[PDB]
Amino acid sequence: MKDFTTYLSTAPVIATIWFTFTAGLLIEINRYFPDPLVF
Amino acid sequence: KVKIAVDRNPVETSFEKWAKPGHFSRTLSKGPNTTTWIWNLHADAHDFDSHTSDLEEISRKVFSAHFGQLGIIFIWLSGMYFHGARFSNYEAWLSDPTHIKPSAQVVWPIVGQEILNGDVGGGFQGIQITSGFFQLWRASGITSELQLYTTAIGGLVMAAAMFFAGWFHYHKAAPKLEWFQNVESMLNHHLGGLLGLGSLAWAGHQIHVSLPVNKLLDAGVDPKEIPLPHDLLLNRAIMADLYPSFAKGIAPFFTLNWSEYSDFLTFKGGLNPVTGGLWLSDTAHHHVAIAVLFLVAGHMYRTNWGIGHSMKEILEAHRGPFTGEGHVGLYEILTTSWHAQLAINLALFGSLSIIVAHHMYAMPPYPYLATDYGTQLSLFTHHTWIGGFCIVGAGAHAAIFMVRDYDPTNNYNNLLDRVIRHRDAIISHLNWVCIFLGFHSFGLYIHNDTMSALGRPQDMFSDTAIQLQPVFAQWIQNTHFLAPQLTAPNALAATSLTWGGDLVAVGGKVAMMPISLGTSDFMVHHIHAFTIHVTVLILLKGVLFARSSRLIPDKANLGFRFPCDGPGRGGTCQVSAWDHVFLGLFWMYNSLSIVIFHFSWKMQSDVWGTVTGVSHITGGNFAQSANTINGWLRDFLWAQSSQVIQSYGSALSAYGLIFLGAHFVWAFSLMFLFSGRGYWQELIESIVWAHNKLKVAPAIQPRALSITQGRAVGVAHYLLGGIATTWSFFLARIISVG
Amino acid sequence: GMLETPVTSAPIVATYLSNLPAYRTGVAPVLRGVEIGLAHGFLLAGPFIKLGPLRNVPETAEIAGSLSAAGLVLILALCLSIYGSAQFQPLFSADGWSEFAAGFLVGGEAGVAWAYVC
Amino acid sequence: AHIVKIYDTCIGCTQCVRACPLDVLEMVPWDGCKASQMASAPRTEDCVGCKRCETACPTDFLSVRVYLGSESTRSMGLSY
Amino acid sequence: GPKRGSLVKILRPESYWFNQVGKVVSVDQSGVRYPVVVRFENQNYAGVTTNNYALDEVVAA
Amino acid sequence: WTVPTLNPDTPSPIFGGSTGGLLRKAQTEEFYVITWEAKKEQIFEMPTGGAAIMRQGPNLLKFGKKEQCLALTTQLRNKFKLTPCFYRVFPDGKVQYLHPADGVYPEKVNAGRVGANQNMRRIGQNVNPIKVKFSGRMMSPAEI
Amino acid sequence: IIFLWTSGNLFHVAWQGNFEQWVTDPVHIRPIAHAIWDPHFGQPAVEAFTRGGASGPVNISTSGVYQWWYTIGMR
Amino acid sequence: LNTIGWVTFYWHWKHLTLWQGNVAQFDESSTYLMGWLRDYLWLNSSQLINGYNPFGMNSLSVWAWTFLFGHLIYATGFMFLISWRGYWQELIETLVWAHEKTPLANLVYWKDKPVALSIVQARLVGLAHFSVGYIFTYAAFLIASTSGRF
Numbered sequence A: 001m002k003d004f005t006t007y008l009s010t011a012p013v014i015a016t017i018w019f020t021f022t023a024g025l026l027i028e029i030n031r032y033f034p035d036p037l038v039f
Numbered sequence B: 001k002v003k004i005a006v007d008r009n010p011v012e013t014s015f016e017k018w019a020k021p022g023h024f025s026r027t028l029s030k031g032p033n034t035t036t037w038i039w040n041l042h043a044d045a046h047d048f049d050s051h052t053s054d055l056e057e058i059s060r061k062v063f064s065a066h067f068g069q070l071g072i073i074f075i076w077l078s079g080m081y082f083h084g085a086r087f088s089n090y091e092a093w094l095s096d097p098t099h100i101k102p103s104a105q106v107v108w109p110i111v112g113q114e115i116l117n118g119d120v121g122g123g124f125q126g127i128q129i130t131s132g133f134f135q136l137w138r139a140s141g142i143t144s145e146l147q148l149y150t151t152a153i154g155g156l157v158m159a160a161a162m163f164f165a166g167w168f169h170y171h172k173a174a175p176k177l178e179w180f181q182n183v184e185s186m187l188n189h190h191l192g193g194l195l196g197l198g199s200l201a202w203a204g205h206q207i208h209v210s211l212p213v214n215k216l217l218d219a220g221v222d223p224k225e226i227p228l229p230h231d232l233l234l235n236r237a238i239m240a241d242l243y244p245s246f247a248k249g250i251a252p253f254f255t256l257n258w259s260e261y262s263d264f265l266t267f268k269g270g271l272n273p274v275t276g277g278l279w280l281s282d283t284a285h286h287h288v289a290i291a292v293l294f295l296v297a298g299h300m301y302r303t304n305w306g307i308g309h310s311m312k313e314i315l316e317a318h319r320g321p322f323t324g325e326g327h328v329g330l331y332e333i334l335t336t337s338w339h340a341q342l343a344i345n346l347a348l349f350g351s352l353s354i355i356v357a358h359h360m361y362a363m364p365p366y367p368y369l370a371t372d373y374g375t376q377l378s379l380f381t382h383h384t385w386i387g388g389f390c391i392v393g394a395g396a397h398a399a400i401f402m403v404r405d406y407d408p409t410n411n412y413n414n415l416l417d418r419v420i421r422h423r424d425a426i427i428s429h430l431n432w433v434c435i436f437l438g439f440h441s442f443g444l445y446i447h448n449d450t451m452s453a454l455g456r457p458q459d460m461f462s463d464t465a466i467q468l469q470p471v472f473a474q475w476i477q478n479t480h481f482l483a484p485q486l487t488a489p490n491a492l493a494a495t496s497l498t499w500g501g502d503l504v505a506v507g508g509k510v511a512m513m514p515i516s517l518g519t520s521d522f523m524v525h526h527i528h529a530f531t532i533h534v535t536v537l538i539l540l541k542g543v544l545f546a547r548s549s550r551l552i553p554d555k556a557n558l559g560f561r562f563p564c565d566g567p568g569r570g571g572t573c574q575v576s577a578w579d580h581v582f583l584g585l586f587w588m589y590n591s592l593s594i595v596i597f598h599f600s601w602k603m604q605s606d607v608w609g610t611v612t613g614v615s616h617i618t619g620g621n622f623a624q625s626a627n628t629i630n631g632w633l634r635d636f637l638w639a640q641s642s643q644v645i646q647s648y649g650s651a652l653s654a655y656g657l658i659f660l661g662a663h664f665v666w667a668f669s670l671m672f673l674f675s676g677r678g679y680w681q682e683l684i685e686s687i688v689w690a691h692n693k694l695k696v697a698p699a700i701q702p703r704a705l706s707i708t709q710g711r712a713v714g715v716a717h718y719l720l721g722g723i724a725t726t727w728s729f730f731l732a733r734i735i736s737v738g
Numbered sequence C: 001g002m003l004e005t006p007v008t009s010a011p012i013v014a015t016y017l018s019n020l021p022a023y024r025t026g027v028a029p030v031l032r033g034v035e036i037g038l039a040h041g042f043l044l045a046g047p048f049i050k051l052g053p054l055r056n057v058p059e060t061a062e063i064a065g066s067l068s069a070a071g072l073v074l075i076l077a078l079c080l081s082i083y084g085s086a087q088f089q090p091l092f093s094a095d096g097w098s099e100f101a102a103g104f105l106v107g108g109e110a111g112v113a114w115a116y117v118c
Numbered sequence D: 001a002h003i004v005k006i007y008d009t010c011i012g013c014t015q016c017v018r019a020c021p022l023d024v025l026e027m028v029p030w031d032g033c034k035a036s037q038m039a040s041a042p043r044t045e046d047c048v049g050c051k052r053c054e055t056a057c058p059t060d061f062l063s064v065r066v067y068l069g070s071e072s073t074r075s076m077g078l079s080y
Numbered sequence E: 001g002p003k004r005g006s007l008v009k010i011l012r013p014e015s016y017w018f019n020q021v022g023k024v025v026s027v028d029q030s031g032v033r034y035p036v037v038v039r040f041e042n043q044n045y046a047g048v049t050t051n052n053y054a055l056d057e058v059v060a061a
Numbered sequence F: 001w002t003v004p005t006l007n008p009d010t011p012s013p014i015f016g017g018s019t020g021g022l023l024r025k026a027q028t029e030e031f032y033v034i035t036w037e038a039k040k041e042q043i044f045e046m047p048t049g050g051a052a053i054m055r056q057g058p059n060l061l062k063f064g065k066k067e068q069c070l071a072l073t074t075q076l077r078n079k080f081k082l083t084p085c086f087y088r089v090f091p092d093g094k095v096q097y098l099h100p101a102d103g104v105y106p107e108k109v110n111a112g113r114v115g116a117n118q119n120m121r122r123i124g125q126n127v128n129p130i131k132v133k134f135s136g137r138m139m140s141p142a143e144i
Numbered sequence G: 001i002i003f004l005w006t007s008g009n010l011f012h013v014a015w016q017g018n019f020e021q022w023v024t025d026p027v028h029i030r031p032i033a034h035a036i037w038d039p040h041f042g043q044p045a046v047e048a049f050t051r052g053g054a055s056g057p058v059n060i061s062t063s064g065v066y067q068w069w070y071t072i073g074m075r
Numbered sequence H: 001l002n003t004i005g006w007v008t009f010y011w012h013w014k015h016l017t018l019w020q021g022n023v024a025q026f027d028e029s030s031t032y033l034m035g036w037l038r039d040y041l042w043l044n045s046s047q048l049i050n051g052y053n054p055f056g057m058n059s060l061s062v063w064a065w066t067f068l069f070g071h072l073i074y075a076t077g078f079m080f081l082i083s084w085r086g087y088w089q090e091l092i093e094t095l096v097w098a099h100e101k102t103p104l105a106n107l108v109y110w111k112d113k114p115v116a117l118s119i120v121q122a123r124l125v126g127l128a129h130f131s132v133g134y135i136f137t138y139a140a141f142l143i144a145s146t147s148g149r150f
């Protein structure tokens, strides 16, 4: 389990999780606030 | 003695080596110091020969890898069936195949991408799919979304079984090397069980499920009203109502009175006129014959009993005066080198995929397929590309064998040796014939361009000026069309409409008509011959000179993949066989792009179109326009690019976006192909200085990509760009004019 | 060692190559030139007549084709002369190659004129 | 002929000599390094300029240098 | 010059590790021209981490 | 050690004949002749492509360029533990021995070799290209 | 070479162009560069490149030399 | 070449929309690259590529031929740009073998030994073909579109 957490701490897995979080956050913001251009 | 041989518990299942990147390589297990390491880690991840010298461990690794691939493919099939059941218009399409467009992908309503869900009919909105799954599913007799859902669950379960099989046969019970080396037994089991029992069980499903359901679908009864398949197995009286042969049961089979099975095992030929596909009775007879043939073929090699042939004995028996020892040593080569096997299997698997493309366009096997012009173009093009890639791969792994596994002290005056020993003659003759083909094939086009530009059309190579008729192909075509009358008496029609004859139309569209070959067809076929010969030249030169040349006498010691041997001796860039694969990749792209252009223009000009006479999609301009480059430039690319360039504001807008994106990626590749890593390393030096100034220089040192990686990135973005460009062009064109 | 093939080491091939006029080793370079020219101009007169730009006009197709064949024979004789001027500074000498090129000019023009006189 | 030079940073590791595919370099007695060995290039007329020696040299910077010069039939690696 | 294990700073201008810091392995006491063996925790483009230097090319910093 | 002589009457390895052998350079300019003595009959790899059987005793091959003889020397020296020497032969008949020109192989030091092409300075101690402008030719600053 | 280039432009305009006809109405008349002699042509090409007002096939110049020469005083 | 191609695409399309009368077309379509590819390159090359066709020819056939000529020289430059030396050196060595072994053509021999082009020469020849094709393609397109539509 320690080795599995080290594997999850490796670089492409963290890039995948972090870009999934960032893309989902932007997707959620563009859903609930549709089409923002200003402010 | 053929038997099961297995080692118990060789490799422990543990997450430890997941947490140590590059564990498999003694060099890469030291850790990263520069950025090059990462790329190496992914490049050498699956090169199992460079991991261990033990053929057994390598063989086990490739076995479990193959299981992983099969599990991935099963996940993919599961996905296609599930999306076909849950997010499609398949039932509506079943109720009206001629006026509903097959769609099995829907997009979510965010950031305006909702427009991609277009009006495909059936009260549905989505992206029209061109994989041909709907026609496959109707041909298999599927009628409801529930059956597709159950197929999805089944394929997912099978994927879990494949990944368990991988884990099991690597970590728990891993086969021994003498298990893997039982190639005679492997051929017997694969020819009998795989191909033989495969086509036998499929013919079983066809005869018992496909034929009645599709006979009712062609009769016109509502799919929901059609009896479920299990009722067809259960009550043989219904089977006897549709085909009275089934009343007598399996008595004519065992009593050898097979003529009474003529209701569902036919030899009609042609296409089903109300449906535009091959007769499923012909397909059932075909799979029964194929089954019996392969089950006969699978009992050829000796295993644990005296009967049966021996592969090494058949090889060592064929020796002549011209070739010396002949096929001696080839058995030893093909039972110890995975790369040789991969070369052979890739060559025939690619060639087979190209044959699949041609035979599936020419003899449409699925119902309502020939008139789904987008599906036909997509399938032909796709399988042609897959084919070409596998051929280039064959050349690659042939060369990899030549460098790593070739050992002449078991291979001394042999077929392979003599080929190596007269390679200069081989390459020089191939060289000359490539230049000859290039000059006369391309020169006719340049000649025509010049004459047309100079206002002298009577001096061109065309059907009205200096004619160059494909007399041989026309003769073969005529013979094929006249074959049912004399040389195939039991055939009611020719095997394909393209030989000649009448015209089969479905829903006002042309399914297939006779294809005529003239001067333009002569010219494109010799262009094809030229490009194929050049690709063969590059790849074959790569494999024959992989070990040595007059330039690099000891090239074998430098490996398969290496940048060069320095700027000396005039310059030795791209001397490696890998670099020959790299150039062969570009030439393969060239060849197959002209092939799919030939197919697209010829079908839209002389075959497809609506029936009122037939009004073709491009009016029949091929015969007069396909003799000049300006003709291809204007009447094909420029003319048919209208749909892609004006696809904005509609559901096809994604094809415009991917048109532009693909152009961009193609161009982006030119930086890697045209430049070199010295410049980039120095640029990175300046940038590293800037990062050092602000205490943000990484501990893993930024390095420019290697020479070979620059070439690899280059050719990959080049192929992706060009192929995706033609993809967007093709799909937008054929969907809007289809 | 050199690879053995029927093509490079056949006796009929050796006799045919020894009988062709570029090999006899004791005939004059003028004679070799006029024989090679009588062969090559006679074969070269054909495709200009049959496929040239005036091929569909009567009585002038053969004239224009033979005239273009004579022009190409003149270009080939100039090529032979400059090849000899570059290479050599009995057939493989400066005087011998100049004799051979003049013989090729004469024999090629004679071969074109005999392919017309037809 | 290509210009091949040896510089006094040589540590006599013999790597360049065993990397040259042409037998151009050799090791001579010397006193400037602990190995008491120095490289030397007495046969640069047969040098093609492949720079395997430069790839094999460990010192930073290089102790063997190949300056590509005028080409001959031996330096172009021609067999014809 | 500097003793074993001490940190120096390289001032040979064409070195890869010029204006940077390494660690002394040994200093040879013969008439060798470049006796100071310095190891570096990062590799050059050749993948080498060790180089000989002179007494006036290293500064104990 | 004395400089050995070429014996042209030395038996050659068993070889069926490649298309990658000699050309007109061997007849006009030079070709090279490699000679070794084997301990047993054994198959090796020809540098021009193909396989060949070396004889038991004196062997003799002839190649076009020098790197072919070096490649066969490296193969016979690292794979078979043999000691070959290859010569340079002209169409005059002039025979030029080399490798090992000292008799001892160049990968080890031998007393008596004169050091050639040795700059007694660093590479960073070279002059600038302004200091070598307008000589009789193109010069690099490392030439002086 | 530059002055021979300029003298050649002047000579080919003066012999094969329409400068004296261009200066009468330089809005509707195209500036001829030089005449075409190409024996590889056909009669449709000769008729097509024979634009006007010229005898045979011409090229229409896009180098501005008629405008420059007319402004600096050539007539 | 990229930068001057950008500045002259921009110059030419803004002036074509000034000369036709609809500067609104440039002001609307200039803000997106599909508007570029559709309304400049696809649109203004309609009379260029109709310079010759199977119905006849007209005065723009020299510019259609030169347009294809520039595309061809550009493409030929890509060969020297992508493929490098040692491939061609091995190919030329097999050609040297074939010529020296062919009977009745080995009576003719070269004075200069044939070798593949060097690395620097290859870069120069590829950049030269690339540049000449670039120049001829845009010259043919610009002259033919402006002269055919005005």
Ligand code: CLA
Pocket: B011, B012, B013, B014, B015, B016, B017, B018, B019, B023, B024, B060, B061, B062, B064, B065, B067, B068, B163, B164, B166, B167, B170, B171
């Ligand atoms: C799930 C339980 C499990 C665990 C803990 C292990 C553990 C191990 N395996 Mg085993 N094995 C398993 C199941 C497991 N295996 C399965 C299911 C298979 C069949 C594929 C195998 C077949 C197998 C082989 C052939 C080998 C191993 C090896 C190993 C050892 C090292 C491998 C490693 O660290 O890389 C961890 C690997 C990864 C994290 C990558 C997973 C790759 C999958 C297939 C990717 C598929 C993704 C797909 C392509 C989607 C991509 C989309 C797009 C982004 C491209 C380690 C002890 C190796 C060994 O023992 O060497 C001495 C070895 O050679 N295993």
Ligand code: CLA
Pocket: B062, B063, B066, B067, B070, B179, B180, B182, B183, B185, B186, B189, B190, B192, B193, B194
């Ligand atoms: C008649 C029995 C039989 C059948 C049907 C197969 C079928 C296959 N083998 Mg073969 N194999 C067999 C006997 C058989 N084998 C024997 C006796 C040997 C030893 C001489 C081998 C040695 C061998 C090797 C080394 C490899 C194969 C591989 C394959 C697969 C090729 C991929 C493909 O295109 O299939 C299409 C895919 C399908 C038809 C999917 C259905 C597959 C299921 C599992 C049915 C196949 C029957 C299977 C043998 C039963 C296993 C039961 C198990 C619980 C004990 C295919 C599934 C390759 C592979 O991919 O490994 C994973 C491979 O590398 N086989």
Ligand code: CLA
Pocket: B200, B201, B202, B203, B204, B205, B207, B208, B232, B233, B234, B235, B236, B239, B245, B246, B248, B249, B250, B253, B288
């Ligand atoms: C290869 C695949 C395949 C399969 C699976 C079938 C299957 C079938 N066909 Mg056939 N058929 C096929 C190919 C196939 N066909 C081909 C290629 C042709 C063309 C020649 C035909 C032509 C044909 C005709 C004309 C007819 C059939 C019929 C049948 C059905 C009955 C046959 C029979 O009596 O078998 C013999 C019986 C068995 C094999 C018994 C099976 C063994 C049992 C299940 C073992 C159970 C043991 C276990 C211990 C007990 C269970 C315990 C458990 C409950 C706990 C059966 C569904 C008949 C039918 O019903 O039509 C609708 C029929 O009239 N077929």
Ligand code: CLA
Pocket: B431, B434, B435, B436, B437, B438, B439, B442, B443, B446, B534, B537, B538, B583, B584, B586, B587, H072, H075, H076, H078, H079, H080, H082, H083
């Ligand atoms: C337009 C683009 C283009 C063209 C024309 C060429 C042309 C050629 N390639 Mg190249 N190639 C290209 C792109 C191109 N390539 C690119 C982009 C790459 C990078 C991947 C390569 C990489 C590559 C490889 C790896 C190989 C080739 C080879 C060849 C030659 C094939 C032999 C032949 O067909 O001779 C016939 C000549 C032609 C088809 C050229 C047109 C000739 C015209 C029609 C007639 C000429 C007469 C002329 C008009 C008279 C001029 C007179 C005037 C001077 C006064 C041919 C010269 C191959 C080779 O040389 O082996 C034989 C080979 O192996 N190329």
Ligand code: CLA
Pocket: B439, B440, B441, B442, B443, B444, B446, B447, B450, B458, B459, B460, C047, C048, C051, C052, C053, G040
């Ligand atoms: C490359 C392929 C190719 C081919 C086959 C042709 C063919 C032709 N051209 Mg075209 N042309 C080409 C490329 C080609 N061209 C290119 C690239 C351009 C642009 C530069 C042109 C520009 C052009 C113009 C401007 C004209 C032509 C014309 C012609 C026609 C007359 C030519 C002629 O009379 O030559 C003379 C014939 C020969 C020199 C024959 C030599 C070749 C022989 C037959 C080879 C035989 C080898 C033999 C089999 C070996 C046997 C060995 C054994 C005995 C031992 C002819 C149909 C003319 C025309 O009007 O046509 C209607 C014409 O005016 N061409």
Ligand code: CLA
Pocket: G002, G003, G006, G063, G064, G065, G067, G068
């Ligand atoms: C390198 C290639 C090149 C080429 C092919 C051209 C081509 C052209 N230029 Mg351009 N030009 C170039 C580079 C080039 N230019 C450069 C590098 C500059 C910046 C210096 C210019 C600046 C330029 C201007 C400002 C103009 C041109 C113009 C032209 C066009 C008219 C032809 C011409 O120049 O007449 C040949 C010119 C001469 C032979 C010299 C003219 C007289 C000189 C200036 C003074 C003579 C003094 C006299 C001898 C002194 C007597 C003293 C007295 C006391 C005795 C032609 C398209 C003209 C144009 O566009 O017209 C439509 C135009 O107005 N060019």
